[PDB]
C-alpha cells in the first residue's frame, strides 16, 4: 500500500486520552516513537490530571497497531498502514471479568509526520473495591495474540483477544477485548486474511518523573500465515 511507505523509518507518536471510569475523570498524554520495520514502540504516558484512578496496565491496550511488523510475505494483510495517512477509527469494548467494562473510541491518523492516537474512554459498572478501582493489579508486563478478521461490510477489520492481568494476591483478572477498525478516508484499504498480532509489552518507570506515568517498550509482529 502507499500508506506502508509512511512507516519505513522511525515515526514520532502522540497519544491523548480522556477517560471517565465510574465518574472518575482523567486525562493521559503519551509521547514516543515507532519503528514498524522492527515492530518496535517506545512510549512514555503521563496522567495530566493527577493520580490515575485505574491501574496503568488496564489502559495499555487502549493507549497504534499500524506499527506492527508485517513479514514480507504477509504485507498484503496490513490493514492498519493501508488506511494511512487519513487513518482509522478503533473501537473496543473491554470486559473485566466479574467487574466493569471499558468502551473506547479512537482515531489514529497522521498529523504531518506524527502518528496521533486520540481516544475517549468510558468505564461503567466497576466494583468500588474490585481489582480495578481497588488498584490490586501488578505493574506487570502483558502479552497476547490479537486475532484479526476482515469486516467487508465496514471496509475494515474486527479483532478479539484476552489479556490476563496478574493480581497482587496471585490470582488473574481477565480482560476480554472486542475490537473493530474502520477507515476514516475513502481511499483503498487492504482487507486481510485471518491472522494475529503477537504482542508483548514491558512497563517501567522514569525514576526522575514525579508525575503518575508509565514507560513502555512494546514489540508487535504479524503472524499466522505461512509463506507460499
Ligand atoms: Na520502520
Amino acid at each position: 500500500s502507499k500508506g506502508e511507505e509512511l512507516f519505513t523509518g522511525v515515526v514520532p507518536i502522540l497519544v491523548e486520552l480522556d477517560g471517565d471510569v465510574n465518574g472518575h475523570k482523567f486525562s493521559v498524554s503519551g509521547e514516543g516513537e515507532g519503528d514498524a520495520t522492527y515492530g518496535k514502540l517506545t512510549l512514555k504516558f503521563i496522567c495530566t490530571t493527577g493520580k490515575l484512578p485505574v491501574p496503568w496496565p488496564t489502559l495499555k491496550t487502549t493507549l497504534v497497531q499500524c506499527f506492527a511488523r508485517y513479514p514480507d510475505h504477509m504485507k498484503q494483510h496490513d490493514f492498519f498502514k493501508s488506511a494511512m495517512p487519513e487513518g482509522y477509527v478503533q473501537e473496543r469494548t473491554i470486559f473485566f471479568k466479574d467487574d466493569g467494562n471499558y468502551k473506547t473510541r479512537a482515531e489514529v491518523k497522521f498529523e504531518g509526520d506524527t502518528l496521533v492516537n486520540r481516544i475517549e474512554l468510558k468505564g461503567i459498572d466497576f466494583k468500588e473495591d474490585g481489582n480495578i478501582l481497588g488498584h490490586k493489579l501488578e505493574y506487570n508486563a502483558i502479552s497476547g495474540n490479537v486475532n484479526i478478521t476482515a469486516d467487508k461490510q465496514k471496509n475494515g477489520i474486527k479483532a478479539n483477544f484476552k489479556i490476563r492481568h496478574n493480581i497482587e494476591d496471585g490470582s488473574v483478572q481477565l480482560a476480554d477485548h472486542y475490537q473493530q477498525n474502520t477507515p476514516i478516508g475513502d481511499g483503498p484499504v487492504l482487507l486481510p486474511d485471518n491472522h494475529y498480532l503477537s504482542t508483548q509489552s514491558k512497563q517501567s518507570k522514569d525514576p526522575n518523573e514525579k508525575r503518575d506515568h508509565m514507560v513502555l517498550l512494546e514489540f508487535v509482529t504479524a503472524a499466522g500465515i505461512t509463506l507460499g
Side-chain angles (χ1 to χ4, degrees), residues 7-10 34-38:
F7 295 86
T8 55
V10 176
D35 196 350
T37 300
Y38 309 95

Side-chain angles (χ1 to χ4, degrees), residues 151-203:
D151 184 345
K152 187 58 164 112
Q153 148 193 120
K154 301 194 209 310
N155 204 38
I157 54 168
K158 285 194 213 273
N160 62 88
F161 52 101
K162 297 167 182 270
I163 301 284
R164 285 178 189 78
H165 296 285
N166 290 331
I167 300 307
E168 68 186 354
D169 68 351
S171 58
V172 173
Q173 170 66 69
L174 172 65
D176 195 8
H177 287 59
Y178 301 84
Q179 175 177 334
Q180 164 90 56
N181 294 68
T182 63
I184 288 169
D186 51 36
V189 297
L190 294 167
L191 296 192
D193 285 4
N194 300 348
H195 69 291
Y196 54 89
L197 303 179
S198 173
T199 306
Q200 68 194 55
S201 305
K202 188 95 100 181
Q203 194 199 328

Side-chain angles (χ1 to χ4, degrees), residues 17-221:
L17 176 144
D18 290 317
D20 171 337
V21 171
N22 276 37
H24 298 281
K25 295 185 195 78
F26 65 91
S27 304
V28 169
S29 301
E31 307 179 17
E33 53 188 37
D35 196 350
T37 300
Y38 309 95
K40 185 177 184 171
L41 287 165
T42 54
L43 294 160
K44 174 183 179 187
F45 298 97
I46 303 175
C47 178
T48 64
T49 43
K51 292 178 19 146
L52 193 66
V54 298
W56 276 111
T58 71
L59 294 185
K60 274 180 184 173
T61 60
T62 299
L63 292 167
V64 291
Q65 292 173 322
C66 51
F67 286 100
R69 181 179 70 86
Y70 272 78
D72 179 81
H73 75 282
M74 282 171 74
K75 275 180 196 295
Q76 66 273 40
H77 305 291
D78 189 349
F79 170 79
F80 308 91
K81 299 182 188 52
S82 76
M84 301 290 168
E86 301 74 15
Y88 54 76
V89 175
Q90 173 166 300
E91 295 167 286
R92 301 213 179 86
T93 308
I94 301 172
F95 298 93
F96 293 93
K97 185 167 182 259
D98 299 322
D99 207 331
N101 55 270
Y102 297 165
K103 279 208 150 51
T104 67
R105 188 186 187 279
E107 293 184 18
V108 186
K109 67 182 294 183
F110 279 91
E111 294 295 347
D113 293 333
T114 297
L115 186 284
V116 175
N117 183 18
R118 290 167 175 96
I119 316 148
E120 309 164 287
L121 175 160
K122 170 70 61 59
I124 76 174
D125 202 32
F126 281 92
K127 285 169 170 159
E128 79 196 307
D129 200 47
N131 294 143
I132 296 85
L133 293 177
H135 295 270
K136 307 186 185 184
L137 274 66
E138 300 205 314
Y139 184 59
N140 159 92
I142 56 149
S143 65
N145 280 353
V146 172
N147 296 114
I148 295 176
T149 55
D151 184 345
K152 187 58 164 112
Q153 148 193 120
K154 301 194 209 310
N155 204 38
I157 54 168
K158 285 194 213 273
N160 62 88
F161 52 101
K162 297 167 182 270
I163 301 284
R164 285 178 189 78
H165 296 285
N166 290 331
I167 300 307
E168 68 186 354
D169 68 351
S171 58
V172 173
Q173 170 66 69
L174 172 65
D176 195 8
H177 287 59
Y178 301 84
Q179 175 177 334
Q180 164 90 56
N181 294 68
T182 63
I184 288 169
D186 51 36
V189 297
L190 294 167
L191 296 192
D193 285 4
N194 300 348
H195 69 291
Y196 54 89
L197 303 179
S198 173
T199 306
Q200 68 194 55
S201 305
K202 188 95 100 181
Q203 194 199 328
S204 62
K205 298 294 184 187
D206 176 353
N208 293 137
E209 172 62 71
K210 59 194 195 327
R211 293 169 292 179
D212 202 356
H213 76 282
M214 178 174 66
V215 173
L216 281 187
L217 171 55
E218 177 159 312
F219 290 90
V220 177
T221 303

